[PDB]
Amino acid sequence: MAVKVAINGFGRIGRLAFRRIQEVEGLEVVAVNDLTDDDMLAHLLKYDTMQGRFTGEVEVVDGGFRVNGKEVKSFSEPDASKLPWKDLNIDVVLECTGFYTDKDKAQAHIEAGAKKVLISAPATGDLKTIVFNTNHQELDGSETVVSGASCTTNSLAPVAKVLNDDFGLVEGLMTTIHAYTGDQNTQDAPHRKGDKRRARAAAENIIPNSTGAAKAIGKVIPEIDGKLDGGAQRVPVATGSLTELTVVLEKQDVTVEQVNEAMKNASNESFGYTEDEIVSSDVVGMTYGSLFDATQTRVMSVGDRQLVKVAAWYDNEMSYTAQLVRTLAYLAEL
Amino acid sequence: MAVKVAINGFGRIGRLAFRRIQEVEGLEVVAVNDLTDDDMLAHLLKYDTMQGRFTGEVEVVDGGFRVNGKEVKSFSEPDASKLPWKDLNIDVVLECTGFYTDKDKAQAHIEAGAKKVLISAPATGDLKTIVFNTNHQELDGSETVVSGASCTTNSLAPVAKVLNDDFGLVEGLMTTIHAYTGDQNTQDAPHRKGDKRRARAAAENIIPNSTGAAKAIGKVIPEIDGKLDGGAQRVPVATGSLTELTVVLEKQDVTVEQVNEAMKNASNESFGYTEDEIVSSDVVGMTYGSLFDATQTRVMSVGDRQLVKVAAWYDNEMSYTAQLVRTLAYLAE
Amino acid sequence: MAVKVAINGFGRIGRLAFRRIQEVEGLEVVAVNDLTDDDMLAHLLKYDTMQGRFTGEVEVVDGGFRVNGKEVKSFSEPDASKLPWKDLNIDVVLECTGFYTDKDKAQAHIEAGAKKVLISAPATGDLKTIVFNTNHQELDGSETVVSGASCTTNSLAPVAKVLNDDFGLVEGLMTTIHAYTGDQNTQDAPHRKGDKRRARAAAENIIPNSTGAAKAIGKVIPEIDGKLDGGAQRVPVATGSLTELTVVLEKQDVTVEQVNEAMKNASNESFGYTEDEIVSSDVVGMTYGSLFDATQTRVMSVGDRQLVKVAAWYDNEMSYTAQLVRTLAYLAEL
Amino acid sequence: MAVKVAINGFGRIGRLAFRRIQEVEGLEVVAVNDLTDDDMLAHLLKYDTMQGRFTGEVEVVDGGFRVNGKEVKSFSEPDASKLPWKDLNIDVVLECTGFYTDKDKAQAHIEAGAKKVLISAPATGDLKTIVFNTNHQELDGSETVVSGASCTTNSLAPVAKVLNDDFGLVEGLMTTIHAYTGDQNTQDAPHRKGDKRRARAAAENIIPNSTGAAKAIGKVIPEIDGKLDGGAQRVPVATGSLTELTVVLEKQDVTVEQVNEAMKNASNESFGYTEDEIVSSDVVGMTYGSLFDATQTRVMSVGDRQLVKVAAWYDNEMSYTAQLVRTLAYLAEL
Numbered sequence A, C, D: 001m002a003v004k005v006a007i008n009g010f011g012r013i014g015r016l017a018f019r020r021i022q023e024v025e026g027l028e029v030v031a032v033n034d035l036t037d038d039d040m041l042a043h044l045l046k047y048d049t050m051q052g053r054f055t056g057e058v059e060v061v062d063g064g065f066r067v068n069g070k071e072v073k074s075f076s077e078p079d080a081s082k083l084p085w086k087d088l089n090i091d092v093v094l095e096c097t098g099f100y101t102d103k104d105k106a107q108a109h110i111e112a113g114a115k116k117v118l119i120s121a122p123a124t125g126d127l128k129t130i131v132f133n134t135n136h137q138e139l140d141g142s143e144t145v146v147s148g149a150s151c152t153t154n155s156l157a158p159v160a161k162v163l164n165d166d167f168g169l170v171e172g173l174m175t176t177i178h179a180y181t182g183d184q185n186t187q188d189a190p191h192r193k194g195d196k197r198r199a200r201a202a203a204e205n206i207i208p209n210s211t212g213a214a215k216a217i218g219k220v221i222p223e224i225d226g227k228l229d230g231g232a233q234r235v236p237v238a239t240g241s242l243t244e245l246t247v248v249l250e251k252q253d254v255t256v257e258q259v260n261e262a263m264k265n266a267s268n269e270s271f272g273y274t275e276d277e278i279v280s281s282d283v284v285g286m287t288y289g290s291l292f293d294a295t296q297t298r299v300m301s302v303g304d305r306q307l308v309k310v311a312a313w314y315d316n317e318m319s320y321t322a323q324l325v326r327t328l329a330y331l332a333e334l
Numbered sequence B: 001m002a003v004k005v006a007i008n009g010f011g012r013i014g015r016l017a018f019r020r021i022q023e024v025e026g027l028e029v030v031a032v033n034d035l036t037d038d039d040m041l042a043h044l045l046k047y048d049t050m051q052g053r054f055t056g057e058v059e060v061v062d063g064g065f066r067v068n069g070k071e072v073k074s075f076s077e078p079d080a081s082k083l084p085w086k087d088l089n090i091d092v093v094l095e096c097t098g099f100y101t102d103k104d105k106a107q108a109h110i111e112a113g114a115k116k117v118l119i120s121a122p123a124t125g126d127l128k129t130i131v132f133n134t135n136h137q138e139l140d141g142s143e144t145v146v147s148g149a150s151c152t153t154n155s156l157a158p159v160a161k162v163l164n165d166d167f168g169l170v171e172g173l174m175t176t177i178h179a180y181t182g183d184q185n186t187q188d189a190p191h192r193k194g195d196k197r198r199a200r201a202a203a204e205n206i207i208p209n210s211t212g213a214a215k216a217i218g219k220v221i222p223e224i225d226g227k228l229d230g231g232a233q234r235v236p237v238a239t240g241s242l243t244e245l246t247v248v249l250e251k252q253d254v255t256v257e258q259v260n261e262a263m264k265n266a267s268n269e270s271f272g273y274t275e276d277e278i279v280s281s282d283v284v285g286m287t288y289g290s291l292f293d294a295t296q297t298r299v300m301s302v303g304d305r306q307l308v309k310v311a312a313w314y315d316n317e318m319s320y321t322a323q324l325v326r327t328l329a330y331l332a333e
Helices: A012-021 A038-046 A108-112 A151-166 A213-220 A256-265 A318-332 B012-022 B038-046 B103-112 B151-167 B212-216 B256-265 B318-332 C012-023 C038-046 C103-112 C151-167 C213-220 C256-265 C318-333 D012-022 D038-046 D103-112 D151-167 D256-265 D318-331
Strands: A003-008 A027-033 A058-061 A064-067 A070-075 A092-095 A116-119 A145-147 A169-179 A207-209 A228-235 A241-249 A271-274 A290-293 A298-302 A305-314 B003-008 B027-033 B058-061 B064-067 B070-075 B092-095 B116-119 B145-147 B169-179 B207-209 B228-235 B241-249 B271-274 B290-293 B298-302 B305-314 C003-008 C027-033 C058-061 C064-067 C070-075 C092-095 C116-119 C145-147 C169-179 C207-209 C228-235 C241-249 C271-274 C290-293 C298-302 C305-314 D003-008 D027-033 D058-060 D064-067 D070-075 D092-095 D116-119 D145-147 D169-179 D207-209 D228-235 D241-249 D271-274 D290-293 D298-302 D305-314
Touching: A003 A012, A003 A318, A012 A027, A012 A038, A012 A092, A012 A318, A027 A318, A038 A058, A038 A064, A092 A318, A108 A116, A116 A318, A151 A169, A151 A213, A151 A228, A151 A241, A151 A256, A151 A290, A151 A305, A151 A318, A169 A213, A169 B169, A169 B298, A169 B305, A213 A228, A228 B228, A228 B298, A241 B305, A256 A271, A256 A298, A256 A305, A298 B169, A298 B228, A305 B169, A305 B241, B003 B012, B003 B318, B012 B027, B012 B038, B012 B092, B012 B318, B027 B318, B038 B058, B038 B064, B092 B103, B092 B318, B103 B116, B103 B145, B116 B318, B151 B169, B151 B212, B151 B228, B151 B241, B151 B256, B151 B290, B151 B305, B151 B318, B169 B212, B212 B228, B256 B271, B256 B298, B256 B305, C003 C012, C003 C318, C012 C027, C012 C038, C012 C092, C012 C318, C027 C318, C038 C058, C038 C064, C092 C103, C092 C318, C103 C116, C103 C145, C116 C318, C151 C169, C151 C213, C151 C228, C151 C241, C151 C256, C151 C290, C151 C305, C151 C318, C169 C213, C169 D298, C169 D305, C213 C228, C228 D228, C228 D298, C241 D305, C256 C271, C256 C298, C256 C305, C298 D169, C298 D228, C305 D169, C305 D241, D003 D012, D003 D318, D012 D027, D012 D038, D012 D092, D012 D318, D027 D318, D038 D058, D038 D064, D092 D103, D092 D318, D103 D116, D103 D145, D116 D318, D151 D169, D151 D228, D151 D241, D151 D256, D151 D290, D151 D305, D151 D318, D256 D298, D256 D305
Parallel strands: A003 A027, A003 A092, A027 A070, A092 A116, A116 A145, A169 A228, A271 A290, B003 B027, B003 B092, B027 B070, B092 B116, B116 B145, B169 B228, B271 B290, C003 C027, C003 C092, C027 C070, C092 C116, C116 C145, C169 C228, C271 C290, D003 D027, D003 D092, D027 D070, D092 D116, D116 D145, D169 D228, D271 D290
Antiparallel strands: A058 A064, A064 A070, A169 A241, A207 A228, A241 A305, A290 A305, A298 A305, B058 B064, B064 B070, B169 B241, B207 B228, B241 B305, B290 B305, B298 B305, C058 C064, C064 C070, C169 C241, C207 C228, C241 C305, C290 C305, C298 C305, D058 D064, D064 D070, D169 D241, D207 D228, D241 D305, D290 D305, D298 D305
16 A cells, blocks of 8 residues: 655666655665666665765665665666556656656666656656645646656746746846766766766856756746746755746835745745745755745845845755655645 | 055955056055965965966065065955055055945055055945946045946946947846855855855855856946846856846847847947857956857847847956056046 | 863854753753854754754843753853852863963863863873863863863773783884864965965865874873874865775784784774775764774785785764763763 | 877867977877867867866867867777778877777877877776886886876886886885876766766865875886885875875885985976975966975984884876876887
């Protein structure tokens, strides 16, 4: 009766989703797929630079690894259509490799025998893009393939919803000052996808780049589709990020206190509120999808014309992972 | 011979200005004031983490130090009314300590005997704020105390001038993604000026903060005074920064190409233009005050309403320092 | 009910000592002295870059802050002799400012009314230097001023004791590859004490420097006084360090396994043992004073002549802090 | 005679060697092989995080790119035996990919038409390993495949030669405090070669690891083969490294000044001497293979028994690259 989860891709999100599922009753990881040996998988689960030691016991066994007494099967299969998801009774696959970010591509898990697939990134094709606590109620239970959107999209959506519901959004630009990620290079080097900026030493530069929220957002809140755009500056922190959003609103006698009060009223398990002068390392490990920071709200007025600026923090690892596990549990509950 | 400069405060900008002054045959630093021994001064001139080795020879000598032959006198003065600027015939003081950022305070150097003071920061009082090649022609030669604005103001001004001249600036917000500076703390610790974010480990955080450019720009371009505002995110690079400006313009069928071409046409020794996908470290050591990056121009349109975003790089160290030494030579000319 | 502790200097060690004491019943902090406002003290207690959020509630009041209702009085006093230790019944002062690291200087707290002072650094004068679980039993309860040695000394002492006790230590050199500390500069800048290397950007360099362990260790283990020396390389991690010790021993058919087994047999609350291939961030927040790493033991032999090398990890923040709080509790229990 | 050079692998060393070569008469790169597009190759040559900007104009043309008006042909060939080295009259290939580090494997370039191959790494098989100005005079001009040793071996050789020639080396242990390299991971992630430590976030950890120097010195100075060993601590600087050697010598009334003076007497283009209290960033871009630092010499004496410690800096990028280009020009001059 526990929901049976398989994780394809045991990278940052895969491993972090495994950690969260250990704490969510009714969800169990029964299988992991990754192109590496089990000694490596167990070790990276156990030790984690930014997120901390895993509490429980992890041991490598012949067909997998035991975690707190439970067996986790590990496979090493690179065509996802060959995975034994049918023999193992998989309810949901968390698709975290980065190589199946499309509806038709992802159906390989479904051919293989899983009941549903949640992609841990924006994805192309005929599927719903879901930010828990913003549009998860769009899910009616008939879905086989779903996108969990991106980390930034998750930090943005509940802020952008309040702005548009309460004040009316005319248009806005976004910058996420964003931690470096695994697909950035350690040293100046040819990048795989030809990105001359992701080619550069990750932890020695401010590096302009694209953000997966720039397009994902309109799919999440359709009534502002086309009204927001922006990008990222990848900077030398290993996790922890900040979304700055600069907007023109319909209402035009808006104040700092009006904006702050409205965000607070919308706060919930996915959307936090803070008036403390925190910095990025202070959100490491947090499980809100977004943390609105009242100390950063700015309102600029020249005659009848206002620009409004807001900021929301997120652990681009754990915020995103917690959002994705919330979607997982909900997707499996109907 | 030569304009005689005295540098008060031998920190990042003071040392870099000395260094910049070594690149400018005919400018000479005849004196340095700082509260530290000469062995420490010479050493810090000689070795530089982000800016690299001083190639010329530096040696410590009885009254101060010898640089590539020339004697530079050094002092351990805590005040600047007691400095022997009169005996040494100082033409201009570069005021880089951060403790004299006001017209009345800075007149101490003038009482001491210097002819002019250029402050390496925004400053209060009855003085002109000057970003070279934006508003340096406001100087008529009667000034005794002048401000060189800030590093961010120097990155912002030529971009904002083009935007307002060409398209008409209604309003705008700014964020500088900015290298950490020496007044930030190494580890989480009490901060001197009470700033709970500058109190935090500089090289382990994204840290929101204030910017000079926020207040200094209206003084540089009066016709947009009050139309811009913004701040900073201090991030873990030791030098190199990026100014992002998000604006509403009067003209409202503006394009990416229109904006880019206009910046290009305005390029000069202080304002560079690039279409290369560079990153921060790529502007370490550069001498433009501002480097416009065409790859980053965005234009957002919903019906008749447009938001325009632009970005410009700067070495908050050498960009600023090079701007300040241009002003210094013009001020003395 | 409780030993009453005053912390002088609310820096890295002071603040961390405050947090450890919340986990150890019998200790309470009743006072903090530092040259900064309360809002800054509460904030830095609450938020910590490398050690994570303070779990409990922290609120500011005038002349202090409260922590879970418990009132903590705060002060601004540069000469320790004017502090109201007498009015507050202070049992032990943790001296963490760095400005009283001498027996006569530290007696200021004693003049002020505290019963005892534990200095969170090596210290000159007529005092004992203590590494918990190496030489704390030297304390007979008559001491008024005591040194808690340094973070490196605390990593080194139990390793050096085993080497000497089991094999006979002839001589040895030490390097600690050491996290940068708050008295290093952010940017190349004049250094307060005239150290041309501590003058340099802390997080952009490998920086040779002194360690407190070279002089403090002979005071901790007298029978090897003068037999060890060495220094540090300050590197760009914010906390987490590693001591490498290269020794000549009396016994000269020593093996990797003999060394390892001897460290394991000596392991305790202050001295851990690991065979896992960990890295520095893995010891962040650890409460051992030293963590011996068996994977780094080396024995070099040419004819009848052996060089032996060993390594021990420590969180130069929390290892040292945990050691110091152990000494504090023992000092007050005598 | 412009010696015609082909570079296989346009990574850190490959790109840096192209840069050195442009500063040295007699050698010219006419071809580059790498598995990436030319726009990427030109960009990474042009911009460089740690070494600064290439002086000179670089433009992308057809069969490669233009540097200072000179055409450089580029290829994207994975099968090297297929490279048109014969049609292009290649004198020497600089093998910098990391995939041909063996004599038999490297002969592929020779089958392809190149006259000689210099491998930019230690290498197995029947070949000479060369540190310029230590053992380059072993080259008699009949060699087709040669190894240029490693960056650390280059830092170590001239120091060890002086110690052995002047004092007699008994035995010694080494640690290189070493900049992170491009085969380390940006984030905790499965490592390609299964190294659980190189798997970890490069710029957030002190990471123990192996050094090529331990395997490569004995081949460079045969009379001390087997007498040295040691490893590395990879730390969060992007370039700039330090080798610490702890030795037992035959002569045993050795002094700090004796050791220092002997290093200084041996100093040359490859082997610099300093008495300044420098740090890692101060060697960035330097062209000495090794820079002996007199400020770090230590001598430890207990009765008749001495341990001597020394340290030499090196830019693991540019020191190594300058050493490699000196060997290249000598190899081609015989």
